[PDB]
Amino acid sequence: ANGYANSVYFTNWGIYDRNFQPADLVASDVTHVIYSFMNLQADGTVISGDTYADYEKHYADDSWNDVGTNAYGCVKQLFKVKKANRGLKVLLSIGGWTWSTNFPSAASTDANRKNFAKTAITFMKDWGFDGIDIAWAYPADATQASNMILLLKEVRSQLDAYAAQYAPGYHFLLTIAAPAGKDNYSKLRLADLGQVLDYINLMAYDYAGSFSPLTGHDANLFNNPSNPNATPFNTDSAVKDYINGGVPANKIVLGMPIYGRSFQNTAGIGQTYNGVGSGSWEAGIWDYKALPKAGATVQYDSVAKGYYSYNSATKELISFDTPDMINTKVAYLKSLGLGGSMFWEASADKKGADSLIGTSHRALGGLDTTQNLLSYPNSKYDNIKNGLN
Ligand SMILES: CC(=O)N[C@@H]1[C@@H](O)[C@H](O[C@@H]2O[C@H](CO)[C@@H](O[C@@H]3O[C@H](CO)[C@@H](O[C@@H]4O[C@H](CO)[C@@H](O[C@@H]5O[C@H](CO)[C@@H](O[C@@H]6O[C@H](CO)[C@@H](O)[C@H](O)[C@H]6NC(C)=O)[C@H](O)[C@H]5NC(C)=O)[C@H](O)[C@H]4NC(C)=O)[C@H](O)[C@H]3NC(C)=O)[C@H](O)[C@H]2NC(C)=O)[C@@H](CO)O[C@H]1O
Ligand SMILES: [Zn+2]
Ligand SMILES: [Zn+2]
Ligand SMILES: [Zn+2]
Numbered sequence: 590a591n592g593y594a595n596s597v598y599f600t601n602w603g604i605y606d607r608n609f610q611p612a613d614l615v616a617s618d619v620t621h622v623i624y625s626f627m628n629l630q631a632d633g634t635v636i637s638g639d640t641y642a643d644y645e646k647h648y649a650d651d652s653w654n655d656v657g658t659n660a661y662g663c664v665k666q667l668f669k670v671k672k673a674n675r676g677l678k679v680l681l682s683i684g685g686w687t688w689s690t691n692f693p694s695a696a697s698t699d700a701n702r703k704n705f706a707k708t709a710i711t712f713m714k715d716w717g718f719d720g721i722d723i724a725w726a727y728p729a730d731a732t733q734a735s736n737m738i739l740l741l742k743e744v745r746s747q748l749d750a751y752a753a754q755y756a757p758g759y760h761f762l763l764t765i766a767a768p769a770g771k772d773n774y775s776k777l778r779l780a781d782l783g784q785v786l787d788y789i790n791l792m793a794y795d796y797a798g799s800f801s802p803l804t805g806h807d808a809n810l811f812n813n814p815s816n817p818n819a820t821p822f823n824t825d826s827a828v829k830d831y832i833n834g835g836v837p838a839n840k841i842v843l844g845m846p847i848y849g850r851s852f853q854n855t856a857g858i859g860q861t862y863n864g865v866g867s868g869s870w871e872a873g874i875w876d877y878k879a880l881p882k883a884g885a886t887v888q889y890d891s892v893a894k895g896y897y898s899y900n901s902a903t904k905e906l907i908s909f910d911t912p913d914m915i916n917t918k919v920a921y922l923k924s925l926g927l928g929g930s931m932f933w934e935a936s937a938d939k940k941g942a943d944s945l946i947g948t949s950h951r952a953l954g955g956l957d958t959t960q961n962l963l964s965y966p967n968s969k970y971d972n973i974k975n976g977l978n
Contacts, residue, residue, distance in 0.1 A: 593953040594788065594842050594929030596621035597946055598682065600936065601642040601663055606870065607937030609911035610648070616674040616860035617948040619946070620929070620957040622667065623764075626685040627712065631694035633701035635683055635708040645717070660970035664716040667734060668977055671717070672963045676958045677820060678719035680762060681712055685724045692725040696736035705740060706747040713761070714751060717965045717973045720762025721748070722790065727773040734846050738781040741765075743934040745785055751782030755967045764788040769796070769827040769844075778833030789836055790931045796822035799865040799873050807908040810921055813893040818859030827927060830869040838926040841885075845918060845930060847937040847945055849875040849898070851910025857906065858890065858897055866905060869937070876937035877945060880909050887911065894918075912948040929953060 591839050599622050603609040614622065628638040644662040647653065651661045660668075667679050684692060695705050722745055723737060728734045741763065748761040749889050762903065765782065767789045768774050782789060797805030803818045813820045824843070830837050851873050855862035865873025881887050885898035885907065896914055898907040910918075930949040942970045969976040 590787075590839075590928065590957040591959055592620075592955045592957040593674045593958055594620050594931070595950050595953055596623060596625045596790070596842060596849070596929065597932045597944065598625045598934040599663075599667075600625050600934050601639050602934040603934070604646065604663065607936040611670055614670060614679055614935055615940070615944065615947065616670050618944070618946045619674075619677055620668070621680060621762075622665065623680045623682045624667065624718070625682040625934070626724065627683040627709070628688045629680060629683060629691045629695055629705075631691045632969060633695040633703075633708070634703035635705060637712070638688070643694060655972065658969060659972040660716065665972065665977065668717045668973060671961050672977065675960050676956070678762060678959070678961045679718070680719075680720045680722045680723040680764060682724050682766070683708065683709060684726065684766075686726050689726040693729070693736070693794075695731050696733065696740040697930050699960060702740045702743040704729070706743045709744065710751055710827055712949040714755065714965060715968050715970055715973065717963070718966060719961050720764065720787070722764045722766060724766035726766070727768050728776055730776065734776050738778045738785065741782070741785045749906050756962055756964060759962050762787045764790055765791045767831070769793045769824065770822060771830065774827060774830060775946075783834075783836035783840065787838060788840055788842050788928055789831065790842050790844055791824075791827065791831065792844045793824040793827065793934070794844055794933065796820075797900050798850040804855050804858055804860050804906050805864050805908070806858065806890060806893050806897065807850045807889065808910055809893040809895035810918065811893055813890060815892060816859050816890070819890060820859075821897075823838065823893070828927070832925075834871050839928045842929050842931040843918060843922045843927055845910055845915065845932055845945065845949070847877045847910070847932050847934060849877065849880050849907040851875060852906045854904050855906050856901060856904070862906070865967050875907055875909065877909060878907045878937055878939045880907060882907070894921075910945060912943055912945065915945050915948040916952050919949055923953075929957070
């Protein structure tokens with residue numbers, strides 16, 4: 590990188606009910622789009638979880654009269670975005686919260702690791718992407734933690750060999766989605782991750798929700814010693830442990846949520862609740878663009894650095910990030926020499942001044958301008974190999 594990352598996860602399932610297509614991305618604000626998620630088999634095989642979303646869906650300008658074997662779906666739409674935004678890199682993300690059960694097996698043998706790297710890189714180079722993001726939630730012991738390093742080294746080795754043959758001098762990126770909870774990150778080979786990876790996407794959110802005994806801030810920076818029940822976690826303790834454990838500050842990208850977590854039948858922050866209630870798309874989760882809801886007021890914990898809405902009438906509390914929160918988090922990350930901002934996920938953002946991703950772009954100042962790759966001479970898709978020319 591030659592500047593800060595401003596990266597966003599784009600979900601392939603967002604093309605359905607959320608109706609958020611790659612052309613809806615405000616691409617001018619983004620250095621990296623992390624395309625989520627590929628699924629994984631126990632033998633290391635990386636697979637599409639949705640071939641329609643990935644490469645079959647025909648958009649308005651996609652013709653069934655094209656000759657040969659061609660890519661459509663989000664793959665062609667993202668290649669269009671890359672052409673129009675030469676500073677924007679697209680990463681292939683594998684796993685995620687719901688598809689991490691097969692990682693231990695996938696990383697467990699030389700054969701499975703070689704099959705993971707080959708199948709992942711096959712998608713990357715056929716689809717015209719710039720790298721790979723591993724989202725293993727989460728390595729659970731020392732065997733898994735060390736096998737995770739062996740898997741990353743196999744992917745790095747195969748990426749370099751691929752570039753040597755089919756993109757000489759291009760550096761394909763290798764990243765992970767990393768846990769903010771010490772119970773998980775204490776198990777990782779932090780010094781090894783610091784050496785092998787381009788970036789660690791720190792998932793500095795999901796600190797409180799339905800899994801909590803009490804309500805709490807979802808993504809606060811600091812502990813609040815005068816209301817510690819509101820801050821079961823804090824980002825700052827995680828960031829310091831990652832750097833001191835051997836991850837260089839500039840490789841850490843600070844994850845921020847474009848959604849809020851709701852608690853029902855509660856008095857306030859750091860208190861008892863009964864149930865998380867409804868959501869935008871799933872129980873207890875609200876898209877940022879739906880917040881704050883009518884009848885709720887937003888209050889700031891200036892010690893924990895966290896905003897939340899409360900509706901006295903409905904006894905509903907929602908923890909979420911505001912533009913001011915992004916400005917505070919960007920000042921924080923710059924103060925520690927971190928690599929930039931990451932967002933989960935693109936579809937829920939507001940447009941214009943109130944955009945969290947746009948707020949971050951403006952607060953960061955100087956973004957990574959490293960050029961993406963448009964040359965895929967070994968793609969099995971004739972339109973990708975021809976650069977959609
Ligand atoms: C400090 C500490 O230790 N805290 C612990 C805490 O971390 C733990 O909570 C977990 O944390 C991790 C981070 O560490 C979370 O995982 C990351 O963060 C994001 C946001 O949470 C994750 O995002 C979720 O990702 C899953 C997929 O993995 C999403 O699942 C999708 O759900 C939708 C439904 O909304 C499905 O969509 C439908 O799809 C069909 C077709 O397939 C379509 O036809 C429909 O129209 C479509 N429509 C709708 C309306 O949905 C979709 O199929 C499915 N996709 C898949 C692949 O299953 C889910 O929606 C995302 N959640 C939010 C919110 O956006 C993300 O996985 C991961 N990021 C990365 C980069 O890895 C994790 O979410 C969180 N867990 C929980 C349960 O919240 C907790 C655990 O208990 O413990 C604390 O101690
Ligand atoms: Zn539907
Ligand atoms: Zn590198
Ligand atoms: Zn700029």
